[PDB]
């Protein structure tokens, strides 16, 4: 019927087959925009016409977006209508409790859509010893500790200077103690430092203790991933499954998410199991656990074991914010219907791929045209 499960199958079928066409952006204005931002890339020497065609082909305009938020915005708009998705976006988030109970309770058996935000505790890891008349908070690298002659400050990621509550005399001693050029601009938590070795290293350990202690009451968390979860109404308590939808910034598209059946793969975890893992992401202190689960939940399909390894290990503590609203399947399905109608009307084809090739060809021809207007 107009069952909520049919809303899932329609949006998966359509994002799989059409990709970036789901935005509803007409191909022509797509290519004119991508021409304007690409003028500088076109070679000025030789056969400009081939140089234009080179930039048009190297152009990734018809690839769908891989942005965490943009994809989530897109799913909200289609599933809730254009103003329902603004109400849902403006309302308050809620932090996933340690056991996930507060999310489990937020899921009655109805057509529900969850929006999730993954925050990272991006606390400063480096420091520089600098004289006051050389420290300029607008020029300096953000998210760093700075030890002036008489003050120890935290320059946060937004450019704000937070004093760390030290006396002048404590700072003067630390400032004069750290004499080695290697340590003038260094890291805050070198676990191999031995304070008993020298006054300098003792000052470094001390400063590390001060910054770790003060950073606990400085709760600067940072948004790091965004996704949605469609939870259609099911016939009974056990038939209830959830389907996460996501893209990952610089990593993969929502179309690729559906091409790899990763929603279906993660859906096979059950609701209790998915909330268990999502919660453990925010309570665990084992970075190998944190990295492994982040891979399972959020990696591109088929990369669950390479996503968060080595330099991509998840060392920073994480937290989960969520919010839940109801879905009107008749509204979602007609919203989906109207995108389908526009794709068919303006980019017709026998199969979805031929509709996609017609879009790209229309956009490249607009692009080719706009680039020739600027390089006439």
């Amino acid at each position: 019927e107009k069952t909520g499960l049919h809303v899932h199958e329609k949006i998966k079928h359509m994002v799989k087959n059409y990709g970036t066409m789901i935005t509803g952006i007409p191909a022509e204005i797509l290519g004119q925009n991508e021409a304007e931002i690409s003028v500088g890339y076109v070679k000025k020497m030789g056969n400009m016409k081939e140089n234009i065609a080179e930039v048009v082909r190297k152009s990734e305009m018809t690839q769908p977006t891989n942005s965490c938020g943009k994809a989530s915005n897109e799913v909200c708009d289609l599933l809730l209508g254009t103003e329902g998705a603004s109400e849902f976006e403006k309302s308050s988030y809620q932090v996933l409790s340690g056991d996930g109970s507060n999310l489990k309770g937020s899921l009655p058996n109805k057509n529900l859509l969850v929006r999730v935000e993954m925050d990272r505790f991006n606390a400063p890891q480096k420091y520089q010893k600098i004289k006051r008349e050389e420290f300029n908070p607008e020029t300096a690298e953000k998210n760093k500790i700075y030890l002036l002659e008489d003050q120890l400050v935290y320059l946060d990621i937004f450019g704000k200077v937070i004093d760390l509550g030290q006396t002048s005399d404590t700072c003067h001693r630390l400032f004069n103690a750290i004499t080695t050029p290697f340590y003038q601009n260094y890291i805050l938590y070198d676990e191999y430092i031995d304070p008993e070795e020298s006054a300098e290293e003792a000052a470094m350990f001390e400063m590390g203790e001060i910054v770790k202690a003060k950073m606990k009451n400085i709760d600067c968390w940072t948004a790091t991933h965004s996704f949605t979860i469609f939870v259609p109404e099911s016939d009974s308590e056990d038939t209830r499954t959830l389907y996460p939808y996501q893209a990952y910034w610089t990593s993969h598209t929502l179309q690729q998410w559906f091409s790899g059946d990763k929603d279906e793969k993660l859906s096979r975890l059950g609701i209790d199991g998915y909330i268990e893992k999502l919660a453990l992401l925010g309570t665990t202190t084992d970075s190998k656990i944190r990295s492994s689960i982040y891979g399972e939940l959020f990696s591109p399909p088929g990369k669950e074991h390479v996503f968060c390894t080595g330099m991509n290990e998840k060392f920073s503590p994480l937290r989960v914010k969520f919010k839940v609203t109801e879905v009107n399947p008749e509204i979602a399905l007609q919203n989906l219907e109207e995108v389908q109608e526009f794709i068919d009307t303006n980019y017709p084809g026998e199969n979805a791929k031929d509709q996609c090739e017609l879009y790209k060809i229309k956009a490249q021809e607009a692009m080719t045209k706009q680039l020739e207007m600027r390089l006439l």
Binding site: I25, T82, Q334
Partner: protein
């Protein structure tokens, strides 16, 4: 629904284009901050003033998109009014100026 959905997404694409072009043009500013002061001037320019854009430090795209948007992008939908475009340019300029006063 669709026309609102389509329009919102086209605006964000134009906003994406303006952000990229201005951020790259701004990456090459002088120590007198000449481009930043000019960008500040756009954020406050009247929705009906069409003379500051007489050749100015601002990049080609912005000046043209402001003066006659449907000529600078002649595939743009009639249902996007010129003032909506101009307000978008002003808003974009304001957001990047605020980032670079802090």
């Amino acid at each position: 629904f669709f026309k609102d959905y389509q329009k919102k997404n086209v605006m964000r694409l134009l906003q994406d284009s303006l952000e990229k072009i201005i951020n790259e043009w701004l990456k090459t500013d002088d120590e007198s901050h000449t481009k930043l002061k000019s960008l500040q001037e756009l954020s406050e320019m009247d929705i009906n003033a069409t003379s500051f854009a007489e050749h100015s430090p601002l990049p080609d795209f912005v000046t043209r998109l402001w003066l006659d948007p449907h000529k600078a992008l002649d595939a743009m939908d009639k249902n996007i009014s010129k003032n909506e475009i101009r307000k978008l340019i002003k808003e974009t300029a304001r957001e990047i100026e605020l980032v670079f006063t802090h």
